[PDB]
Amino acid sequence: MNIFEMLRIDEGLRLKIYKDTEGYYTIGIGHLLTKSPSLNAAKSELDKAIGRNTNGVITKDEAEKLFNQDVDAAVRGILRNAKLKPVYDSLDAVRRAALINMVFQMGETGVAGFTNSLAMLQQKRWDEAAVNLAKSRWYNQTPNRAKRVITTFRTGTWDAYK
Ligand SMILES: [Cl-]
Ligand SMILES: [Cl-]
After folding, report:
1. How far is CA 146 from CA 15, 56, 108, 139, 157, in A?
2. GO: which molecular function terms?
3. Which of 48, 67, 70, 112 has the fewest CB atoms within 10 Å distance of its CB?
């Protein structure tokens, strides 16, 4: 198991524009297009991202390519983030994947705000961090996914994903 497989399980894969759990236009493997309520605005962001007149449909390869860029960006955003970097540097490989998942979902800014959970993770207080991570809108809105990431941080294994 690895980050790609992990997120592929959490996000799924859709070849046409769809709305995410927040009602935002998305495509592929969780690639947000726009937070705007306009389908056209989403179609426009889509063609801009792929580099062709898509008409709101992409292929599998195109989706995978958006995915690769998105995962790379997340890692790189973590590394440039003063609050995130040290946590990531402190963790083992499995757990690093859980932090990446969260950043991919919520953005760097969103994650850097889990101040308290961040500190606990950094100190390797697994059970306490899991409890703290759960008192969040994130957990209340997407409980199953959140539970999987939380267990990953708690255990350091991929069990939640097998
Ligand atoms: Cl893009
Ligand atoms: Cl969920």
Report:
1. 24, 29, 16, 5, 15
2. lysozyme activity
3. 48
Say how many domains are in the chain: 1
- Residue of 66, 38, 39 lying closest to 52 (CA atoms): 66
Residue 106 burial (CB count, 10 A)? 16
CB atoms near residue 118 (< 10 Å): 20
What CATH number is attached to the domain comprising 36?
A: 1.10.530.40
Resolution of this deposited model, Å: 1.8
10 an active-site residue? no
Method: X-ray
**Ligand 2 centroid – CA 138 distance (Å):** 9
Quote the CA–CA distance of 56 and 53 in Å, as a whole number: 8
